[PDB]
Homo-oligomer: 459 residues x 4
């Protein structure tokens, strides 16, 4: 009778929860735990995204306002990673003095709720640091000399800091000049909800950088905002988000227990069948449960990081987002296993998974041509094409070219002053596009004439 019982076991282990009900009126409480998971995880992700949008928008808007306030002649768009640049000694002096003077008159210039903030030394003021190579008989060591400009120093009607010997810069040895100050703001765009607003501290540094010593000073504006508590303020949910994140951890933990239970019990059924087969003489793994386990672990980790961020009021959510997003993605891929319970969501799998070896072998072959073209393009067209500046950019450009993106712009971007490089670029681009189109279309006719045989043999 043990053979019949074993056969009934697997006959029950291989059917969908919808059917298992038909066979035994059983309730898949585990499938329910999964629907409640998809709803709770998606809800948490959306709420987290909305709150992050609000905070990030406030910080970025304040940064743009600061750039307009303190950078002289700021266009409104960052030239590069740096905001603006100067090419003349008098331009650099004007930018430095403009930043200092705008800080002096902040209360009459700012449109928002800004005030001066105490520095790390507990004093309202401005710090300017400059670095020079010590001394063309320059040395290799750098000299760092700074002074602290208090509000009393700036407020003197005859300004003495402008005429001081500090601000003679000797630009041929100058490495950089750095201006640091702190500002305190408030977002009143939160009081219309009877919730006390969040006071912010801004640590702004302006760096006038000429490490390159190429005749251009690059001006970087960096604003680091952190959420302090409000001290001087009188007008007229923390546990809620935390309980929700704790429930999410409970559901994704319960799912983690159940899936690991099923995998362990699946290994037990293998023994019985394997031992039974021995006497007379990955399918059991169900690698969707691997995906579910990974997504549960990632959701638990991301929820813990989110709780930690909310608890201590921290504003960088990059790694918390990378866990929650990559776990929600896997949750929706797990919806496909449930969808992949009706027989109709199959039959094309006999090609979608069977072609995978052929495609992966093709990728290995085409990968070597792709690497060779990447190296060639970087070395040759690097100094003449902005899409070939570095190896990673070359790889992205070649990937996009394989997909038809910006071909004419790619051809036209390279100037014709160097005739040899122009001819080589033409040959390079034409050969790459033609060769890869040919290879992709070939791979493909083959994949077809193979499936044809595969499906013929299957029937």
């Amino acid at each position: 009778m043990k053979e019949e019982c074993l056969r009934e076991d697997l006959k029950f282990y291989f059917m969908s929860p919808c059917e298992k009900y038909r066979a035994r009126r059983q309730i898949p409480w585990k499938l329910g735990l999964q629907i409640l998971k998809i709803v709770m995880v998606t809800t948490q992700l959306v709420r987290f995204g909305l709150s992050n949008q609000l905070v990030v928008a406030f910080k970025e808007d304040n940064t743009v306002a600061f750039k307009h306030l303190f950078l002289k002649g700021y266009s409104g768009t960052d030239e590069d990673d740096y905001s603006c640049s100067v090419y003349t000694q008098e331009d650099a002096y004007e930018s430095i003095f403009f930043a200092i003077n705008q800080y002096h008159q902040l209360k009459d210039i700012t449109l928002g709720t800004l005030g001066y903030g105490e520095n790390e030394d507990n004093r309202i003021g401005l710090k300017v640091c400059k670095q020079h190579y010590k001394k063309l008989n320059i040395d290799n060591d750098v000299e760092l000399d700074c002074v602290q400009l208090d509000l009393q120093d700036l407020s003197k009607k005859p300004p003495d800091w402008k005429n001081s010997s500090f601000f003679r810069l000797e630009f041929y040895r100058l490495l950089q000049v750095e201006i640091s100050f702190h500002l305190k703001g408030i977002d009143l765009q939160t009081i219309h909800s009877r919730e006390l607003p969040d006071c912010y501290v801004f640590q702004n540094t302006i760096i006038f950088d000429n490490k390159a010593h190429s005749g251009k000073i690059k001006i970087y504006f960096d604003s680091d905002a952190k959420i302090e508590e409000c001290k001087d303020l009188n007008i007229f949910n923390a546990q809620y988000v935390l309980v929700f994140d704790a429930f999410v951890i409970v559901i994704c933990l319960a799912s983690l227990i159940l899936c690991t239970r099923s995998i362990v019990l699946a290994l037990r059924l293998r023994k019985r069948f394997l031992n039974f087969f021995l006497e007379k003489y990955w399918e059991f793994i169900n690698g969707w449960y691997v995906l579910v386990i990974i997504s549960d672990l990632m959701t638990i980790i991301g929820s813990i990081l989110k709780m930690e961020i909310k608890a201590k009021n921290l504003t960088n959510y990059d790694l918390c987002s990378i866990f929650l997003g990559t776990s929600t993605l896997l949750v929706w891929v797990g919806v496909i296993r449930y969808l992949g319970y009706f027989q109709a969501y199959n039959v094309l799998i006999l090609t979608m998974q069977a072609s995978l070896p052929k495609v992966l072998r093709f990728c290995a072959c085409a990968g070597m041509i792709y690497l060779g073209y990447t190296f060639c393009g970087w070395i040759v067209l690097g100094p003449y094409h902005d899409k070939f500046e570095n190896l990673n950019t070359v790889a992205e450009c070649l990937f996009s070219l394989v997909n038809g993106d910006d071909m004419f712009a790619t051809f036209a971007q390279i100037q014709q002053k160097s005739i040899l490089v122009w001819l080589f670029s033409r040959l390079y681009l034409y050969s790459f596009i033609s060769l890869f189109i040919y290879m992709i279309l070939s791979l493909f006719i083959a994949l077809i004439t193979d499936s044809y045989d595969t499906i013929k043999k299957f029937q």
Copy 2:
């Protein structure tokens, strides 16, 4: 003999109007009613579009002129949903005073036929409203205080409104300042047709908005134009368009009667055949007639809305256009049924409609991956990529990426200051593009090796 008669019925019910003439010299007056419909509906749509183009062009040109007249330092292009922005208290004051002074001197500045218009209170003048949080000890309530600047007030050679206590703004509590005025224009670009021109009333509001309190005031210019009747004017078709719209309603109503008649009579023939089949023991629906009925209803509704708009001289035609366009689209799809009467416009239908279940099943599976990628991309790359700002934008970006659009720009838009987010973005984009290309090409080889069998079985 009833069997023969029934057989002759269906033998007549299944043939084209061109053939039914061969079988009985009958005139398909109903097919004629359809050609006259396609011509009348298309003609009405084109005439409506041309007239709307004229009116909208006049209104938009006047709005651009107003923005140049009243917005200080207007570039010519709206920065965003708002036209321009300021970052300094003195800039905001300059913009406000510039708007007021330009309104004061309108007659000497405008190039067109503009004049002052009476307000809702029947008085030529300018209204300025400002909103402040009541009182950092601010309250949660807002205070709205306004004054009306008449032309006599502005025309005083010593201006007293500039120095009044109204225009001290206390920007840290300011929510917005709003300027409202009315102008009356004429389009003389209609007199060259001996048709009396249309006098317009413009309700212009300039909103200096800093609800965000982020250090930037956004300046919105909104112009609401309505067509009044001309009062002061002496120089040297309404029924026509209305009769045409009424004829359109008659033709699309007659077609509605005939199609509903045929469907009802089609149900009668089903009874006869079904009862006949019972004794010895959607095709009849002709779902093209469903399309014709829907298009007729939409055309009647759109024509009624068009008549209502023309009757009371109203200038917003968004919903009238959405009915007429979506009905003309369905009319041209109904041309395909007539085209689909020759046998040659078939045979490919045996795949165009048979593949539909497989494609729809594929869309269900790929839809879950698409949703997962949408959520992941929004949560991770949202704060760093302008094409991932919100969920709808992420969905559009992913759809476009599946079609090869702006891949290199999408890769390059994300800055590399955050290395973790940069690496994740690279992995995300590469995986999405590769996976979806693989899935689409797979779906496809399958659809082929299936049709092959389907067409083989058919023959």
Copy 3:
């Protein structure tokens, strides 16, 4: 013996010139006439293109210089079909007076070889014309009043034209103000070849246009350049190009005779075979010769027009180019018949021409959906999308969308202030792209499963 002779005829009429030599050592002097044609026609086209490039470049460079000289605050790029625009009465006055003053001081401002040219009335000077509606009690008639500003009038140290009653404009009735003057230039960039340079006459008109009466004056600069003969000039091939064009006409005329001879003689062989077939009881046309005849006619016409243009020194070559280009295109298509003489350049024709009926039938069906979408998109998204402004633009946008071009930009271009139009635009774009991708891929699986059968039956 007549049967054998007839059979030998066709056996000779159906072989390639290369083979006919193998069968009879015959020289295809006619195939030679064709190679000399491809070389002579291509050479003529290239020479014509180079000379046109030179002339057009000179004229366009002079036009750009004129725009910088006479248009106040010209950016360097035309805003639209018009060069620049103004929105204030004082701006319009400044532009008009700037143009007049720059003309007054031309000799000291121009960098090239420019001088004043006599007008149609044989007098060096400037003409200003203005148009007003006669007289709000305006009439429907226009009044045209002008004055001629001579160089003596402009050179008076107290300028009287500025203060004259002519230049009070009454902008509310103004239609346009037009400034006309003539300049004479020389291209010294032709003397370095010992060829006397070409003196030009420029007829420049500046139109300050406000027909719209929308508060914007559009400023058009139109320069009409014609090649006069040089009068005042002393420094230190016309028959050649003409003889070459005459030889081209001879070769394309000889080819026209021979092809028409062969077609006529081909009809003779049809009679013999057709009569022979009758006794016991397009292939002969060779529609490549139709292409050759059309290309010969077009080349002769284009060469005649080119000779006419060169003879009387005229500078508009639009229709001459459209004949020469479209004839050279057909000449290269005729190279394919010669290439299509080896057997290997066939066998794929059994699908390239057999699929044509199925594709054309598909285009008829998809054409109706394309027209419906064009009308719907124009009527709905016309006032909100710059790619849907008019019907032709909508058709081009839909064609490009079918090919994957600017999808994200097309989605993003439409603003979200109108929620109904935004939702409809999303539905419209998604449905169009999905439907047309589906239809194209379907047409295609069908074309395959058909060729498969076609090629199977062929063997």
Copy 4:
């Protein structure tokens, strides 16, 4: 026994190095020489690219700084191949005088480490050369007259060079004005590595060019930088790169010997088999070795050029890069032969190489249509479309259009003032896109229905 020995020979000559070990425990020291080659060649290329990036970045940054210092009103972006342009005599004078005055005050304007450099005549100063047509009674000869402006000449408090008769230019005869000067810089961005920095000499020429005589002067800034040795400098690997390049030459020379040895020995085995076949009565070439030999030759040549460049301190690496890149590309293609030793990386070759004749025949046919369209588009749309300016640009535009790139932009770029050219452009673009899409999809259905038969016959 010689038959058995011969059979054993080939049985050994046709197996992979991995297997030959299974058959004889032999060590493929030659395959090792290949892995060490791929690592050494890639390493050399990467190091060369990084060093070139540094040098080129320094030179380009200095050039941008020079353009900002010496070009009046420089925007920051080159208008074209030329940096900026002027259209007025006074603008040209201002630009010339601005360049001279900025050179005079260089020490107080430059941000980097710049100084005056001696000219070719060993004297610090500025040279201005102007060219005029000799003398409208101009001649054909040019007159070149120049003066040398020393620092003493520029430093005189009353400037005499401004008022000299040299700088009256007579613009109607002017060909160009050229300003030449030398500057000496240092990159201190190399001292932070205890490596003495590289002093540079810059040969800057500013050319005010109006060869066109079209009313625009084009201003070219050309900076030629060469690495001199440092003379005045006191602060606080050449053999390494050279030994590495010499080792690379040894490995790519040893590989060249071995591959040529194998090819020669391969020809010996052909004799034995061919003679053996005679008695009773490219595969042997292994054209991968041709690729290896070519890549070895290119690597040796590129390494020699790199050694020559490093030895004499020269900064143009265009041809050295074109050899190293195109050799590294071939090295990665040679990785595919090793990958193509497992049987699985085959079977698709039976189509990837068999389709090549059909595709090449298709390219020959489609090439003639492509050439015809190129000529037609250039001749017609050349003067109206910036993507059709010259034949090469037309070819690139058509290639991109075949791949779906910028279709709507291509359609929209051509203005509608000329209706005939607009209609022809529409017809041209539509016909090209439709025809080439049709031909590519046809080629393709054929390639499939052929492989099907090919693979069927193979089995």
